[PDB]
Amino acid sequence: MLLIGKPAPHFSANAVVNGTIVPDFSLDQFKGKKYVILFFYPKDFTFVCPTELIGFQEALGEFDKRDVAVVGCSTDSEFSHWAWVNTPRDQGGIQGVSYPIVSDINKTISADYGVLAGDENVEVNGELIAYRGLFLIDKDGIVRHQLINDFPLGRSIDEAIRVVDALQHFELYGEVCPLGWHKGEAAMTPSHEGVASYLSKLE
Amino acid sequence: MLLIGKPAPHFSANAVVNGTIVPDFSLDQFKGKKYVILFFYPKDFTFVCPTELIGFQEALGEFDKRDVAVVGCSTDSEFSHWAWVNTPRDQGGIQGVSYPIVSDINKTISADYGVLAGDEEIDEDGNVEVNGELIAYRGLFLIDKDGIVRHQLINDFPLGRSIDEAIRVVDALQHFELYGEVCPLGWHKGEAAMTPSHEGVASYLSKLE
Amino acid sequence: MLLIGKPAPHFSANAVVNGTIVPDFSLDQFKGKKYVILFFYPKDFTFVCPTELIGFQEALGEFDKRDVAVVGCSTDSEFSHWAWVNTPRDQGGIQGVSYPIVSDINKTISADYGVLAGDEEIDNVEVNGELIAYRGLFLIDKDGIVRHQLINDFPLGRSIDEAIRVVDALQHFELYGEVCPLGWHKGEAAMTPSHEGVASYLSKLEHH
Amino acid sequence: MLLIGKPAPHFSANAVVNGTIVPDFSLDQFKGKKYVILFFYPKDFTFVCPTELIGFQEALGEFDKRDVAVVGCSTDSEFSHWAWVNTPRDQGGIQGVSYPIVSDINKTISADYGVLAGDEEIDEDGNVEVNGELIAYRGLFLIDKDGIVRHQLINDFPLGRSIDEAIRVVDALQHFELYGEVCPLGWHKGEAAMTPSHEGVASYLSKLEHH
Amino acid sequence: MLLIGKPAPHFSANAVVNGTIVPDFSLDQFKGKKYVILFFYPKDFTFVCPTELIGFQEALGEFDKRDVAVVGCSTDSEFSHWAWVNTPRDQGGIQGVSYPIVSDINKTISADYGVLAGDEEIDEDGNVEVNGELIAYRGLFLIDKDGIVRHQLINDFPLGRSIDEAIRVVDALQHFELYGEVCPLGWHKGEAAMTPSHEGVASYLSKLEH
Amino acid sequence: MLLIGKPAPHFSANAVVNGTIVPDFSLDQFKGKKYVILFFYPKDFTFVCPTELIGFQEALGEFDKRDVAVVGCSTDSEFSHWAWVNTPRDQGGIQGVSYPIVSDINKTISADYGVLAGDEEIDEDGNVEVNGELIAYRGLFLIDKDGIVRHQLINDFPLGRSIDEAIRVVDALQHFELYGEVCPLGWHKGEAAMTPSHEGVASYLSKLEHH
Amino acid sequence: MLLIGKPAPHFSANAVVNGTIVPDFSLDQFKGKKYVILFFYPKDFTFVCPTELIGFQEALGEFDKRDVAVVGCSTDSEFSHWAWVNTPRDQGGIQGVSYPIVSDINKTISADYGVLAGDEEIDEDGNVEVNGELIAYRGLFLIDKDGIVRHQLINDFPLGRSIDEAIRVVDALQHFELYGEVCPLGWHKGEAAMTPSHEGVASYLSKL
Amino acid sequence: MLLIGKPAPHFSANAVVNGTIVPDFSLDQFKGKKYVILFFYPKDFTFVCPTELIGFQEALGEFDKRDVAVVGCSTDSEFSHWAWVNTPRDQGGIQGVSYPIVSDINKTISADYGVLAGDEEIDEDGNVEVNGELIAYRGLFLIDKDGIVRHQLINDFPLGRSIDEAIRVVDALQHFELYGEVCPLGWHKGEAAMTPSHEGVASYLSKLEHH
Amino acid sequence: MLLIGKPAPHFSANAVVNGTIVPDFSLDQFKGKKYVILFFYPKDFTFVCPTELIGFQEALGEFDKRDVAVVGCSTDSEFSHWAWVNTPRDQGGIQGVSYPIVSDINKTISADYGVLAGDEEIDEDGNVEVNGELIAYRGLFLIDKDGIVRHQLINDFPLGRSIDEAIRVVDALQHFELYGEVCPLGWHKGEAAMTPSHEGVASYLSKLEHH
Ligand SMILES: [Ca+2]
Ligand SMILES: [Ca+2]
Ligand SMILES: [Ca+2]
Ligand SMILES: [Ca+2]
Ligand SMILES: [Ca+2]
Ligand SMILES: [Ca+2]
Ligand SMILES: [Ca+2]
């Protein structure tokens, strides 16, 4: 489903924050204060998912500098999350992951964000688990960027950081970010003069 | 909607291929033969859109080497596309863009791929009213040789995309197809992949330590 | 659609006025002030459409003297319009067209005015043909009421003369209460809408 | 209704042809043989309508030479039509009009062609009330030999139509059918048409800047 | 539909009154003042209809003396009516007909009175297809001064009506209104009516035996 | 209901024929053989109804000569009908009435012919409420040999009908059937009818004006 | 339908009371004052029906002494009833029947009491066809002073009813109302009733 | 429900026959062979019900002589019935009742025969609530050998029924079946019946008048 | 019916309490005062049901000590219940059963508690037919002092229940209510419970691994 330009759907669920189970976790707390990178993964105790979670843990300071809160989510229970953060990495665990890991135990968050796999007396084709979904949410709670990958295709922290940098650049300077833009490169004024001037300089 | 794991919706529209208007363009031709990178942009003759189109033209060799066809799409007419490829780049044009640029003139492609902006309503006697513009967001899809969507990405209007990220996802999909190894976070071609098993993930994570 | 005797459907869209993109263009501004000749064409950068747009530009004074605003419209974007008015005529452009060219980007204007081509069928929703505007033209009086409409197939260009003639007939009926007979032109004899009026008008045809 | 590019709706009704009442008149007979100019008017024995009908009768040869059948229609009965063609013109009649005048006595033809005036409403108990008069506006349709509508025009009650514009649209349609050239704004038979191509439109528009 | 004992449906249409087109004609004007004989015929410029209209014109005084307004109606336009009253009788016209002739141009009046011929059906493309002609049968209604229908009659197209029967029904209605006696079969003004009671019917039928 | 041009609704009920109760009486028996004058009255043992029934008995020969079967009907039972034909006329009875008197005991015939009085409603508790009496008004129908209704008439309760008008309408129907001439206003057997054509009506009206 | 324990449906119709046609006859008048024996019969001028009506007339005193109003009803008109009470008994008439005979001219009373014979079938358009005759079967109802039905009985057309059974049920109802004793099988006025309790039924059955 | 003239609804339930619980009891077995008197009572182990059941046992021979099978029914289980027939009469039991006593444990029989008390209603909460007790009133049905209901009677809870009235109605039905004579008011076996004709009723009432 | 965590459905019915028929029995009276063990059985005068009812009578003191009211229920009438408590046990009776035995005579309680056996289906005649018997399975519910169902059990007809398991679940619920410790598998009063926490479950299981 299309959430670009729309408010990130509200939820309130159990989560693991700093390795501790906490109730009533919501993205409300970040409105007006932090951007949010919210990412969904399919299953605790699997393969690409721990590497993605651990990598987000390693880059957590880079998101902190940018006023970005990192939030993970799967449809597993908060107790599976807790068991997993208490499993050492050399045993496949995600020990040391300290940002919030939301438990979408009813699958309503994954459904509302349009990342729930499977197809639906009531019978279900496939597994109702989340694909590798990622959303960039601005300080107003609006979705500005989304990405969904199939199960075997891990995501990239560099691209998430790049889109964060681009959004903040557009918010600061009103300049739109052209293809392949990175922090420090030339942006563009959104006008006829702007596009003619930017494209002439490239050639 | 959610197209991951599902066939990319079929279409058949006018397009500009190698600067020429052609009819009945479809992604059918690529089934069993090429991967497809399909990207939607909002409007001809604008700002971020020409930079994305030109950059895809410049990187076309990287996609050719990987058996990937690049296809652009907007809801503008095929003639607006043709005028745009016949406009020099220093005037905001996209001259030299040679891959197909599809005209989603009926907006059905953008709807089917879930990238169409705007909201529609039915009033008391107001028929269909639309809030906002029915144009495509900066949407991108990776379609494998069977026509299945394996990756999708949508950016708001002012956020241009990245060719490197598209190439990386192509490499990850092709690596998983060849070796059955899943690609971990931040993976690039030539780096260590992973065996999808308990021992595989445990051993992979031990090497990082 | 049947719009004669009914208000022209309201709209508010981006347009190019005097070669510049402007937002929130509507026919509201003309209610009580000007008549409107509103014409739809299918596609920017095509064939008959530039000749019609340029010709409406050349005859623009004939409409000004009659308190008629000329407004064109297609389902192309306002940026396509802007690119087209910046293309020289010898290359197929419509450079110098200065009256408002509305962008019906959502196709709701053409739908509401009954000029949108194509057929919509549900299976998703599939469309047979192209959802673009036919060569449609509407005369709207100062109260916002449609008094004349005409739609031509894609290859059949319209005529400025017939538009001016219908405008003259409407204004003559508004002024004198006389109905305009077949082939009436400004300055020719009209008719009083009564038994005596039609008998007298037709008798003179058999006297001269 | 939007009929451009679509078949002209079928009908079969009483008419006055050559001053005589005949049944089962339809435009089927013209498919593959003649173009049709079909025009609706609101009321027999009124004001603009006799001038339009008489003018079409006098210009009938111009349509005959172009393989065009002229057919008129209103929702009055065939007997009103018959009485009207037996009324001398100097008293408001349409004597001498010999082409078919269709009686749309049930108003289904006018409704199908999208020219029927009035507004239809249902009551709090289910009765059918009508605001205004269910009569035809000044509607005109050009139907090609395949029965497809290529041009349509509707005028308010006091605004008579123009035979010149009807002939011009016929000539433009026939020129496009014969030569595949599209007819630009204000085109008349014998003037330069246009090739529907990038080069064609560029060539046409460049020549206008000099001529 | 059955209108006996129910109000005559309201309408407001163009009509030709005394040979002149007038708008907003209604039977409301007659409420509390006059009875109404309202008759529908199918088509202007035809065959039985001019004879019925002319005959009503010739008998107009018999209805005036009885405080009865005569109103004709068809689904033709008011201009067809006007042309018809300006056509001489020796050419099939109805010249000299001066009472109101209503134009039921939308066919709603004929529908409301249940005299409209033809059959309407909606096809699966939305449009309405019609078998036959939506024109009025030869319908006649007697409406009292309260606007209530007391007598109705419908004839097929080739069967002209009878002025005598209309006058007889008017006289019977007025006699019952005045004296409260019910009118037996074949009753005419001046003949013996009947008291609506056991004794009344026994007495009336006894006298008929001689 | 509008029955002109439509088949008279079928029924099959008990009746009194020649003073005898008989079952399964229907107008089917007359199809192809006789016209039918079918008349409804409200109640046995009342006031106008016996005068109408007796008068139809007195004129029975006039209808026999014209191949017309006379049939009466009310929503009373066949036993009330039978008792009534066994009550002498000087006591309010209809002794001597010999044509069929149908018992519309279920009120379905009166409903089908559009002559049933009264108003039905559904009450609070889904009950069925009736305003007035579900009895037949003074309804009369002329049915031709094909079973099609050609003339219908309904009178309020206190207004007795007229045998002369029924016979006149019968003569008009039979004249149109025999000669194809339409019968003008006030036409009676032996007078001039009319050819349904322009010339026919013009000729008929000319003869009246100097007559 | 089951009316036992529920109010007898209200009605208001023409009737013949003491040989005279009267309007607006209803059982409301008896509420709080009299019991009602209400009986339906199929057709005036038939066979069992006159014997039942005459017998109810002859037994009228037994109902009067028990504060019971007798009311007959059929779907025939009030004038048919009046003609029938003016017919001598030796010719099949019901001369001398003086209690109210209701005219259920609309058949709504017979429907509301569930005694109307026949079957109604309805189609899409609503055309109502009927199998059989919509006339009342030989129905009888005992209504208490509150308007509550306490006993009902319906017989097929050829099976006449019994005055003794109606009077017996009246006696049983009045006995239960007065003494709170339930009436066993075959109970008659003056015979032993029963206390509605374990001991009451055990003691009653022991004596047999 | 109105069952007169209609087939007695079919059922198949457990019953106590001659003091023994048996399955699949139905009235089908009696079709074409015996009349049926089927009676419903509300509750086992109560007050009027044992007297009715015991009295029907005592009169069983009178019904046998008339080819009548007696069947009782309540919505109690077959085991309550069995316990009750094993309870001595001097303790309120129905020991010695040997004809079939049906267990309408699903209440469907009492519903089908229109003798079930109580009212069922559905809420907005979707639940089913019941006003009163869903038990059978004192209902009685006479079923002929073809399975058609010819007589029915329902009494309020405190009003016991009458064996005499059942016998009398049985005799009347059998008399009408044999002789085609209808039974007048108060008729008993051996008394004068009536021929269903005008003459029959006229003659019968005359003998009552003078004598 | 999943009632765990939801209020026990309300009812108000006739019952036998201490061998006496009483009206308007409800579990309302126990809210805030007593726990409720509510058990359904299929039929009076059968086989497993008397053993269960008598066994609950014998264990009544064990429930009294725990502030638990024992209530039985079947769809039999209150009079069948009364007869059954007046039958000696050596004849299959339940003499001496003094706690409330509810009569679910309308079957609404069994339906609301999800223990009603049988299958209902509506005929084409809108009629309701039932496959099987609408009787209660061997259902048991533990209801807390707030009226909330905390434990439920349903057995097929031939499988009698266990007093020990009912007492055990009562003890487990009361232990959790008093001390907030959850009761592990097979817990009995006096044995070690568990703190619902990570450390609590780890510590509980550590002690088991030794013993
Ligand atoms: Ca879900
Ligand atoms: Ca669309
Ligand atoms: Ca649209
Ligand atoms: Ca219509
Ligand atoms: Ca009916
Ligand atoms: Ca039930
Ligand atoms: Ca139930």
Coordinates of C-alpha atoms in Angstrom, one line a residue, chain B residues 21-204:
Chain B
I21 CA 7.4 6.6 -30.4
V22 CA 6.4 2.9 -30.6
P23 CA 3.2 1.1 -29.7
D24 CA 2.3 -1.9 -27.6
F25 CA 5.3 -1.8 -25.3
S26 CA 5.2 -4.4 -22.6
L27 CA 7.5 -6.1 -20.1
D28 CA 6.3 -9.5 -21.6
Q29 CA 9.3 -9.4 -24.0
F30 CA 11.7 -9.7 -21.0
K31 CA 10.1 -12.7 -19.4
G32 CA 12.7 -15.5 -19.3
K33 CA 15.3 -13.3 -20.9
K34 CA 16.1 -10.2 -18.8
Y35 CA 15.6 -8.8 -15.4
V36 CA 13.8 -5.4 -15.3
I37 CA 14.4 -2.2 -13.4
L38 CA 11.1 -0.3 -13.8
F39 CA 11.0 3.2 -12.4
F40 CA 8.2 5.8 -12.3
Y41 CA 8.7 9.5 -12.1
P42 CA 6.0 12.2 -11.7
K43 CA 6.2 14.8 -14.6
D44 CA 8.0 15.4 -17.8
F45 CA 10.0 18.7 -18.0
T46 CA 10.6 19.0 -14.3
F47 CA 13.7 18.9 -12.0
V48 CA 14.8 15.7 -10.2
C49 CA 13.2 13.5 -13.0
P50 CA 15.6 14.5 -15.8
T51 CA 18.6 13.8 -13.5
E52 CA 17.3 10.3 -12.7
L53 CA 16.5 9.6 -16.3
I54 CA 19.9 10.9 -17.5
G55 CA 21.8 9.0 -14.8
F56 CA 20.0 5.8 -15.7
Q57 CA 21.2 6.4 -19.3
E58 CA 24.8 6.9 -18.1
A59 CA 24.7 3.7 -16.0
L60 CA 23.0 1.7 -18.8
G61 CA 26.1 -0.4 -19.3
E62 CA 26.2 -1.6 -15.7
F63 CA 22.6 -2.9 -16.2
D64 CA 23.4 -4.4 -19.6
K65 CA 26.3 -6.4 -18.1
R66 CA 23.8 -7.9 -15.6
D67 CA 21.1 -8.7 -18.2
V68 CA 18.9 -5.9 -16.8
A69 CA 16.5 -3.9 -19.0
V70 CA 15.9 -0.3 -17.7
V71 CA 12.4 1.1 -18.2
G72 CA 11.2 4.5 -17.2
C73 CA 7.5 5.5 -16.9
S74 CA 5.3 8.5 -16.2
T75 CA 1.6 9.3 -16.7
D76 CA 2.6 11.9 -19.4
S77 CA 1.7 11.2 -23.0
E78 CA 4.1 9.5 -25.4
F79 CA 4.4 12.7 -27.3
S80 CA 5.4 14.7 -24.2
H81 CA 8.1 12.0 -23.7
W82 CA 9.2 12.4 -27.4
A83 CA 9.4 16.2 -27.1
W84 CA 11.5 15.7 -23.9
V85 CA 14.0 13.4 -25.4
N86 CA 14.4 15.9 -28.3
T87 CA 15.2 18.7 -25.8
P88 CA 18.9 19.3 -25.1
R89 CA 20.0 18.6 -21.6
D90 CA 21.3 22.1 -21.0
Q91 CA 17.6 23.2 -21.4
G92 CA 16.2 20.7 -18.9
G93 CA 15.8 18.0 -21.5
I94 CA 16.6 14.3 -21.6
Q95 CA 18.3 14.1 -25.0
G96 CA 20.2 10.8 -25.5
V97 CA 17.9 8.7 -23.2
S98 CA 17.6 5.6 -25.3
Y99 CA 15.9 3.0 -23.1
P100 CA 12.1 2.7 -23.1
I101 CA 10.1 5.5 -21.4
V102 CA 6.6 4.3 -21.0
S103 CA 3.5 6.6 -21.2
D104 CA 1.0 5.6 -18.5
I105 CA -1.5 7.8 -20.2
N106 CA -4.5 6.1 -18.5
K107 CA -2.7 6.1 -15.1
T108 CA -3.6 2.4 -14.8
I109 CA 0.0 1.3 -14.6
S110 CA 0.8 3.6 -11.7
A111 CA -2.4 2.4 -10.0
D112 CA -1.5 -1.3 -10.5
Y113 CA 2.0 -0.8 -9.2
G114 CA 0.9 1.2 -6.1
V115 CA 2.8 4.4 -6.9
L116 CA -0.1 6.7 -8.0
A117 CA -0.4 9.8 -5.8
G118 CA -3.6 11.5 -4.9
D119 CA -6.9 10.5 -3.2
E120 CA -10.2 10.0 -5.0
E121 CA -13.7 10.5 -3.6
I122 CA -17.4 10.5 -4.6
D123 CA -19.4 13.5 -3.5
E124 CA -23.2 14.0 -3.2
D125 CA -23.4 14.6 -6.9
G126 CA -19.8 15.4 -7.6
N127 CA -18.8 12.2 -9.4
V128 CA -15.1 11.5 -8.9
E129 CA -13.2 14.3 -7.2
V130 CA -9.5 14.1 -6.6
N131 CA -7.4 15.6 -3.8
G132 CA -3.9 16.2 -5.1
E133 CA -2.4 15.1 -8.4
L134 CA -2.8 11.6 -9.9
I135 CA 0.9 11.4 -10.8
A136 CA 3.5 8.7 -10.0
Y137 CA 5.8 8.9 -7.0
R138 CA 9.5 8.1 -7.5
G139 CA 8.8 4.3 -7.6
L140 CA 11.3 1.6 -8.4
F141 CA 10.8 -2.1 -9.0
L142 CA 13.2 -5.0 -9.5
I143 CA 11.6 -7.8 -11.6
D144 CA 13.3 -11.1 -12.1
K145 CA 13.3 -13.2 -15.2
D146 CA 10.1 -14.9 -14.2
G147 CA 8.3 -11.5 -13.9
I148 CA 8.2 -11.6 -10.1
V149 CA 8.8 -8.4 -8.1
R150 CA 11.8 -9.0 -5.7
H151 CA 12.4 -5.4 -4.6
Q152 CA 10.5 -2.1 -4.5
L153 CA 11.3 1.4 -3.4
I154 CA 9.2 4.6 -3.4
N155 CA 10.5 8.1 -2.7
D156 CA 8.7 11.3 -2.1
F157 CA 8.9 13.9 -5.0
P158 CA 12.0 15.8 -3.8
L159 CA 14.1 12.7 -2.9
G160 CA 16.1 11.4 -5.9
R161 CA 17.0 7.7 -6.1
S162 CA 20.4 6.0 -6.2
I163 CA 21.7 3.8 -9.1
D164 CA 24.2 2.2 -6.7
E165 CA 21.5 0.9 -4.5
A166 CA 19.6 -0.6 -7.5
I167 CA 22.8 -2.2 -8.8
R168 CA 23.4 -3.7 -5.3
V169 CA 19.9 -5.2 -5.1
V170 CA 20.4 -6.6 -8.6
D171 CA 23.7 -8.2 -7.4
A172 CA 22.0 -9.6 -4.3
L173 CA 19.1 -11.1 -6.2
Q174 CA 21.4 -12.7 -8.8
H175 CA 23.8 -14.0 -6.1
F176 CA 20.9 -15.6 -4.3
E177 CA 19.6 -17.1 -7.5
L178 CA 23.0 -18.6 -8.4
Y179 CA 24.4 -19.8 -5.0
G180 CA 21.3 -20.1 -2.8
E181 CA 23.2 -17.9 -0.3
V182 CA 21.2 -15.1 1.4
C183 CA 22.7 -11.6 1.3
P184 CA 23.2 -10.0 4.7
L185 CA 23.0 -6.3 5.6
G186 CA 25.3 -4.1 3.6
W187 CA 26.3 -6.9 1.3
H188 CA 28.1 -6.1 -2.0
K189 CA 29.3 -8.4 -4.8
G190 CA 32.5 -10.1 -3.8
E191 CA 31.8 -9.9 -0.1
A192 CA 30.8 -12.8 2.1
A193 CA 27.3 -14.1 1.8
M194 CA 25.5 -16.6 4.1
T195 CA 24.2 -20.1 4.1
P196 CA 20.5 -20.1 5.2
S197 CA 20.8 -22.4 8.2
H198 CA 21.3 -22.2 11.9
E199 CA 25.0 -23.1 11.6
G200 CA 25.3 -20.7 8.6
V201 CA 24.1 -17.7 10.4
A202 CA 26.1 -18.6 13.6
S203 CA 29.3 -19.0 11.6
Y204 CA 28.7 -15.8 9.6

